[PDB]
Amino acid sequence: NATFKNKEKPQEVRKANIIAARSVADAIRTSLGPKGMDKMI
Amino acid sequence: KDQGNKKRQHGLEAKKSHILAARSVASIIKTSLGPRGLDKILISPDGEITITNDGATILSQMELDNEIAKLLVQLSKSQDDEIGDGTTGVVVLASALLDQALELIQKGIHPIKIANGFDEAAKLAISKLEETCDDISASNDELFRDFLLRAAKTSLGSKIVSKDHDRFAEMAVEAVINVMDKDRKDVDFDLIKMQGRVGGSISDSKLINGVILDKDFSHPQMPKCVLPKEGSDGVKLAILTCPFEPPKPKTKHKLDISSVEEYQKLQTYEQDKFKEMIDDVKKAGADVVICQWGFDDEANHLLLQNDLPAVRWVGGQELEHIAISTNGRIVPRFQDLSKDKLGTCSRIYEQEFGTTKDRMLIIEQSKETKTVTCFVRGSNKMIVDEAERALHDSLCVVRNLVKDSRVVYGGGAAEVTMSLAVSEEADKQRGIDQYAFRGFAQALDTIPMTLAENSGLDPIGTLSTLKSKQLKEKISNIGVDCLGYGSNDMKELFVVDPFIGKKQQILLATQLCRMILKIDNVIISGKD
Amino acid sequence: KDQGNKKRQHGLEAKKSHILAARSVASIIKTSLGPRGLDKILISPDGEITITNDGATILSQMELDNEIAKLLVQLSKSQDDEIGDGTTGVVVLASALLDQALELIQKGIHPIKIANGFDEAAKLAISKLEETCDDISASNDELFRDFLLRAAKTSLGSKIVSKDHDRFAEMAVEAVINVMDKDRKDVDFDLIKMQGRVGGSISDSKLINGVILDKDFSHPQMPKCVLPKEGSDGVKLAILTCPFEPPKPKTKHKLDISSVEEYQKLQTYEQDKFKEMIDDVKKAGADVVICQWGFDDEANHLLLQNDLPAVRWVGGQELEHIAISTNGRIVPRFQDLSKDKLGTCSRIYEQEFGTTKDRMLIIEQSKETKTVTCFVRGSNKMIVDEAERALHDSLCVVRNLVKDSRVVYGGGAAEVTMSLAVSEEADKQRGIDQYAFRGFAQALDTIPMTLAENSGLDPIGTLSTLKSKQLKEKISNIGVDCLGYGSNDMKELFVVDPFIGKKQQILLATQLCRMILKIDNVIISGKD
Amino acid sequence: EGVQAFIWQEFASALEVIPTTLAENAGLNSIKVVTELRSKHENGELNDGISVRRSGTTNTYEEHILQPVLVSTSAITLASECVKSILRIDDIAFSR
Amino acid sequence: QIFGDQVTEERAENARLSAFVGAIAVGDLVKSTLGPKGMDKLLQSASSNTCMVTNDGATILKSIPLDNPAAKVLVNISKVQDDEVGDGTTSVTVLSAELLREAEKLIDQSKIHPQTIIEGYRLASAAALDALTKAAVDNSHDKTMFREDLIHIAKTTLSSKILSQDKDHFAELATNAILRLKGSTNLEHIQIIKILGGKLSDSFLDEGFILAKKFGNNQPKRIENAKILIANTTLDTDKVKIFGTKFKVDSTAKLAQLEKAEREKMKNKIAKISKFGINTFINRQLIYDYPEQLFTDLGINSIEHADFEGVERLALVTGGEVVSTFDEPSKCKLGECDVIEEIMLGEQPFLKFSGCKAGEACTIVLRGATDQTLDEAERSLHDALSVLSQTTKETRTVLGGGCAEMVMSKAVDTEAQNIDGKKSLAVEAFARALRQLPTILADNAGFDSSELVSKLRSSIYNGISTSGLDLNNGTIADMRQLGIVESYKLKRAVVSSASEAAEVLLRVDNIIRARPR
Amino acid sequence: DGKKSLAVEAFARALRQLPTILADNAGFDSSELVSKLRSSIYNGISTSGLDLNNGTIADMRQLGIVESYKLKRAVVSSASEAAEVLLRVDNIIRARPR
Ligand SMILES: Nc1ncnc2c1ncn2[C@@H]1O[C@H](COP(=O)(O)OP(=O)(O)O)[C@@H](O)[C@H]1O
Ligand SMILES: Nc1ncnc2c1ncn2[C@@H]1O[C@H](COP(=O)(O)OP(=O)(O)O)[C@@H](O)[C@H]1O
Ligand SMILES: Nc1ncnc2c1ncn2[C@@H]1O[C@H](COP(=O)(O)OP(=O)(O)O)[C@@H](O)[C@H]1O
Ligand SMILES: Nc1ncnc2c1ncn2[C@@H]1O[C@H](COP(=O)(O)OP(=O)(O)O)[C@@H](O)[C@H]1O
Ligand code: BEF
Ligand code: BEF
Ligand code: BEF
Ligand SMILES: [Mg+2]
Ligand SMILES: [Mg+2]
Ligand SMILES: [Mg+2]
After folding, report:
1. Catalytic residues of B
2. Are B410 and B468 found together in one domain?
3. Class for domain E1-138+395-517, per CATH?
4. Per its UniProt record, what CDD domains does this chain match (chains B, C)?
């Protein structure tokens, strides 16, 4: 078709946030449950 | 050894990285897949500016250091090599696959076991297509010419060339017919000089039934054009690889001159010797001379007076096309002339160009020679240099159609037939291979969806329609309304992709996946 | 000494440099002379952004190292000091003069002899104006108010304020009448608080017949407004410079406490001591307290219960305006109260402001006090800070009109009358002073011409018209159609510049010239 | 229908991460326990779960694996709300 | 030469550009933070770990560093608008900037003097601003109707922010919280207290007023029919202001006397207070161990440290008066309420007063799942409390959702019929820029803005002057019919505060930066 | 169609900017002059042009201001190509210059 373009695109900022954010709940995943292991900081 | 400056990756991260790196290469070129696609300005570190919707070309130019990308660089490349049209797409499909593969991994699946899953589901799709495809060669002769064209056209819709896609298409169709035979089915691209120069618009891009080359025509006084020389069989021309200069050894020299005796004989030796050649060619009975190497001031003038237009210095591939174009023989010495080894061309003119002091020349033939010269023109370099690669793209899809008259209707539908068929076999799979098959087919869906995204259609929407319609009726070919027009059905719409290529593509991606996945260990060092 | 890092200039170059440097400073501000002028964003090295058509202000802000410019910086400044309106123009005239002076120099004239030429031709113009000028004070009372205004207005046309120039003008007219007397003819600007805050537009800039100050009104419970306290003579208010806290020495302390005896007496000492003050003010019979320094928690509460709104801490100039505004006396100790030294103001309210948690307060009076407070408002800082200086400009032209009711019609015509008269005396001069007089008058012509340039009129054109018309009729006042309207004649148009200022201006430039020209030697060093 | 269904569908699919990572940490076969638990959930109900002890899927209420109902309530309540104030971010300018 | 050492000059063409670009740039930063379908921007200061997400225009602009005058001018205009009305912070920059954009057009490619572009604008503004007043209906009278009016303002002034979700909820809170004052336009009377945990929909306005700081050493954990003495007086070593009083004795015993002597002053003052007959004594100041012990043993509850604002709040819910002189009970309005019970807000001690004498001071408790959500819901609310707080001090109202400005457009686009030559163009441009607001509004939502606004303008063109943009069906429905009212002061402020911006800038023909230090 | 039209109108618009820029340099109120010109060529004539001296709009064929057809045809062409090749760009990549 031929209608509204969205010249703008910081679409990427969202996926970027999600990925740079999901990487957090990653380091954690390992410590869930009676088989979860502790972290040493 | 060299312990420092050496990093290591392995799964937790690693796989994410790679998968993401692919995905990202993709995100750039996805906006270039479609007849609504867009090009990308790439700049050489030297400063060379290019502009092109061609997949391979883009990813080759992106000077990039990520190892996985380096791989997709070749993925689009290899495909360009084997077919000539996949490029932009092969990577898309590949990435989608990876994202998909990864997704499963965080659910407890083995990377290598997903691999085998994909390879399998793939082989299936290849088949479900190899069965639904249609044939052209074996159906008609005037319709073969048409279908063969209706592909070249579809193959150009995603290029700046699109503007005048009628001509550029019928040009590519022709250019190939004229240098490959229905039996050998071999298109040797050395028999097709893809030469382009600036000027006019891309519209003034014609096809030459001979060759071009750049020459001032030896002596200025010489004529500009060349008639078939009264009632003769067209024009005859000399095709010699011997210099119009006094013959010399090839081992030593030192022609010792004891006295005025011999120097007196050399004197008159070179003198009439120039007549020994100028005569020689006249004898074979030719109109114009095309010599590989230059002539002397004397020898040139003679070629003038004797109405023998000349062509000083003509490269290998050059001289050679002038032969095959005009049906002649490449004559060594001078005495090896003869009216029967000449070139039976149909005309020769010195072509003018705006006010450009260059002003090359041309050699026509009227009847389809065994050499074509797609001579591309444009308002500016980039338009040309792109339009040439755009022409090339089509010329390739025309070659693939003789090497395999099989055709599949693209518009995304070709990829929907797989996704549909492959997903069916998923339910029967169950267990682990179920996730793989679902995945493979699922990645595929991104191809049409992306087309919808670029043509302005809701992805999930066009997909459900394309899937339903291509099921509620027959696992046929119902594509995306990429441009509009009535409705789907690439057939009516005349959207066609050569099968042979499509297979290659839907393989090259799964295979490339199958490699990356097997990588669970990485070790990079620096540049000491 | 210090031979190095020390340069020297002298005539060949030198004079060019200086002359040009002036000229260039000029070229910037010329585009700001006129009711069609434009402002200039200046930025402090700290980061402070200002925007203003004011001459002096601009050239003060241009952090500049050229010595001659440094001089024009003060030239516009000094004039601002003495009048308050010249600024933008005084420099223009000065530069023009210099260019002119220079021009002659390359024809063999002595710099110092041109000087005396200019000083002379000048003195003449000053006279030819001092004669053609008109008078206001000695003519009427309602017309004085009008003329005095018709100047303030003309004085504002080249400012952002222009928008609402009706109000800003009648405001400046008033603000001065109310603090200077027809006899002394002295406007002390300490009697006019030029305070401005943000909000609304510049339109919501009113004039306050009292003062403002920022106060929460001591105790929160306190009322917000203050009535004239039933049938009384307006409101009465305490004006004390003594703190509502237990009195203390001013030399030492060490109130030695031998035993519970005396500590028992101090105990009840501070206690009722707070009543000794709270009572004291009640006795003088006042409504509200305006104390220079803060009060204690106790003393405050009491002021509450006793319906005594309070004003903790009020600056010098602050407390002082509250006196002169309300006709009161600045009372030292507490016992020095009395119903006859109070402040007979007409109202007091705690003024709200948008949602700004600040929320200052005000003290009105109804009848024209001996203190005005032009309270400026605007949509953004810069508009305010400019509008305040814009207000100031007019307030000054109103002060100059009482100090010399003489008026000349500007619009450039005022400068044309000189150029005309001064040029006449040129023909009689002959010889060297002829070139000077011609020059002086010629530089002058740039003033109106520049107005034409900015209002979009051909310079040479408007000049010939302004000159012819102001000669073919009478060496009167025919100005430039700066805005349009019917035609020239600043009189009808109501364009007026106070004479007193105009003289100063047309002097300050010639004098400054007279200095620069005498400089034939320069010696600059660096910053070791 | 349409949009709302796909959204919900994924959200439902999301929650399965808790059992998947649970099962994963146990070294158990996620995909196995997932499904074995989905089906066993088709008949059984809010009791059929993973138990590291039993190393498979059994009743997690009878195995005394009790979890305060509030915990899971303000777990999804918070997470689900969080994403919203994240998905709302459409640009990021560094600003000091 | 002249000038020097890094000073930079921008003449005509240059200056004008610097300016235009700046403003246009600023505007194009906050265009997304408008419209009910608008988005938030995340930012982070000198601490890095000090992020924040927001849809408040003025917020973003206030933070974002800039070197460009013209931009700072716009930033600043935002803080102003943010002051006198608490809202429109975005709508103003945008309309301000778009007007400049529309101007460089009339200059760079039409060749019109900026002063004449001002001439036109100044007129267009008159007409525009006018049509507003001339079309703004109010409900000052009928207090039972203006409640419905006022609640709509919050309803819509809250869309676009996170709260747009449970907007209806906060709608009431705001309304009620303002009404519970009905007077003081100073919002410092409403205390907002936030704490993580659970949905925003869990936020509430304790009509009984909550307070932090627990009372007494271990006093009654709940008062009954409380009679409180709200006071602010020195409660750790007196002698108020006699400073210089030394205690020279000739023996430790004479010290021991004077020592218990001081500790007596406390039992004295503490007594003069007990004489006030109260079951609760709140002091702004503190109250050390001993002066407290007294109370713990008299039953009077000691709730110390509530600063200045902390008392004023209590003194408005309970109805008491500050006081610091107990030199005589009575003549001191004592405050009262039904209960002063201690409650717990997610891991925290608080004092839920109840049934106070018409609380003209309230507490709103905000509940979000992350500090980000709170801090934004914080102002996202303030953007409501501020308008409403003003509309009670300006009952006039007008319909937004495009409508308002679109009306001012048809106004200006009309008065541009009687005009001179060039000026007209600036005038037409004004209405044009104004029209860009509903455009940018619809844009963010995702419709073919061009097409939608042209439909809108068409209704408002041909009568109606009520239609607006339903940014959901993407149609153009009746705003008065949809409760999308907006404060008149607000819109009038934008159309004004912006025009000023424009004029101050169009008038610039040079920029000079000095040698920054 | 709908949107397309707009680009079309824009073309003629840009084209019109040529006489504008032409008149601009001369020093006339270009906006005003070109609008006069376009008005004649609008309402028939197709011959009037800009006398960049009286600042009026006189007849060009009447004033010997002919131009090669190849020239103008070239401009209107060579430019449109420029446009298309650029509008089609949705990314730019500079490599590590050496
Ligand atoms: N006996 C168990 N068998 C299987 N799951 C259990 C068992 N006991 C507790 N768990 C799981 O352990 C999970 C994670 O706990 P933990 O790692 O401590 O993180 P948190 O408790 O903070 O979620 C709980 O959600 C619960 O489902
Ligand atoms: N005219 C069209 N209508 C529908 N589909 C088309 C059309 N033109 C090309 N396509 C789709 O786009 C694909 C080509 O993408 P393109 O952008 O040309 O990159 P490449 O061809 O290099 O992969 C075709 O194979 C087909 O799937
Ligand atoms: N309204 C006007 N019409 C004609 N001349 C005016 C008008 N307004 C100001 N002028 C001229 O411009 C001069 C003021 O210039 P301005 O730009 O205000 O700088 P300054 O007043 O600081 O020199 C007046 O003295 C007069 O010569
Ligand atoms: N429900 C809605 N439907 C259409 N327009 C609305 C709606 N709610 C508020 N608006 C519009 O939102 C605009 C204000 O956007 P906002 O992001 O709140 O910026 P500001 O900071 O100016 O409030 C106003 O023009 C108002 O008319
Ligand atoms: F875009 Be492809 F190379 F046809
Ligand atoms: F421009 Be001036 F200072 F009146
Ligand atoms: F962004 Be606004 F203040 F609603
Ligand atoms: Mg292709
Ligand atoms: Mg002035
Ligand atoms: Mg708002």
Report:
1. 54, 87-88, 393
2. yes
3. mainly alpha
4. TCP1_epsilon
Co-location of C231 and C308 in the same domain:
yes
DSSP E strands, C304-431: 310-311, 343-345, 347-349, 362-364, 372-376, 406-408
* B9 and B128 share one domain: yes
Answer yes or no: same fold for E1-138+395-517 and E139-215+350-394.
Answer: no
Searching chain B, which residue's CA lies closest to the CA of residue D30? B108
Chain B hits for D29, Cβ within 8 Å: 108
Q: In this structure, are C214 and C341 located in the same domain?
A: yes
Reduced 3-state DSSP string for E90-159: HHHHHHHHHHHHHHHHHHHCCCCCHHHHHHHHHHHHHHHHHHHHCCCCECCCCCCCHHHHHHHHHHHHCC
Which ligand 7 atom lies nearest to the CA of residue E34? Answer: 1
HSE (CB half, 13 Å, CA atoms) of B338? 9
Q: Do residue D24 and residue A10 have CB atoms under 8 angstroms apart?
A: no
Q: Tell me the H-state helices in C191-252.
A: none
Calpha distance C305→E332 (Å, rounded): 8
Determination approach: X-ray
Indicate left, alpha or beta for E418 from its phi (over 0: left) and psi (-120 to 50: alpha).
beta
Taking CB atoms and an 8 Å limit, are E239 and C61 in contact across chains?
A: no
Instruction: Quote the DSSP letter at residue F62.
Output: G
* Residues in contact with B268: Cβ distance below 8 Å, sequence separation at least 6, in sequence order: none
Q: Find the closest chain F residue to B43 by CA distance.
A: F94
Burial C439-468 (b: 16+ CB within 10 A, else e): bbbbbbbbbbbbbbbbbebeeeebbebbbe
The H-or-E segment that residue B407 falls in is strand B406-408
Q: For a substitution probing ligand 2, which of B83, B451, B466, B499 has the most ligand atoms within 8 Å of its CB?
A: B451
> The domain that contains C299 carries what CATH number?
3.50.7.10
Asked if residue B131 and residue B13 are part of one domain, the reply reads yes
CA distance linking residue E3 with residue B85, whole number of Å: 63
Which fold would CATH assign to domain E216-349? GroEL (3.50.7)
Q: Which of C393, C433, C445, C497 is catalytic?
A: C393
| Rounded-to-integer distance, Cα C306 and Cα E332, Å | 11
User: Is the Cβ–Cβ distance between E374 and E54 less than 8 Å?
Assistant: no
Q: Is the distance from CB of E286 to CB of E235 less than 8 angstroms?
A: yes
Q: Do B225 and B358 fall within a single domain?
A: yes
State phi, psi for B41 to the nearest 5 degrees.
-70, 115
CATH of the domain at C504: 1.10.560.10
Give me ligand 8 centre to Cα B53, in Å: 9
Domain that holds residue B179: 137-209+370-405
Query: For chain A, first and last CA: distance in Å?
Result: 56
Q: What whole-number distance in Å separates Cα of residue B117 and Cα of residue C177?
A: 97
Look at phi and psi of residue E319 and say left if phi exceeds 0, alpha if psi is from -120 to 50, else beta: left
Of D18, D22, D90, the CB nearest to A10: D90
Bin B307: left if φ > 0, else alpha if -120 < ψ < 50, else beta.
left
- The single residue of C50, C52, C57, C88 carrying the catalytic annotation is C88
B501 Cα: distance to centroid of ligand 5 (angstroms): 12
The structural domains of chain E, with segments of one domain joined by +, span: 1-138+395-517, 139-215+350-394, 216-349
- DSSP 8-state assignment for residue E467: B
- Which residues in chain E are closer than 8 Å to C250, comparing Cβ atoms? none
The two three-digit tokens of residue B501, written as one number: 């290529």
Same domain as B223, residue B365: yes
What are the angstrom distances between the C-alpha of E314 and each of B182, C490, E278?
99, 66, 15
The domain at E139-215+350-394 falls in which architecture?
2-Layer Sandwich (3.30)
Indicate whether C431 and C387 sit together in one domain: no
The Å distance, Cα C469 to ligand 9 centre, comes to 25
C-alpha span between C433 and C439 (Å, rounded):
10
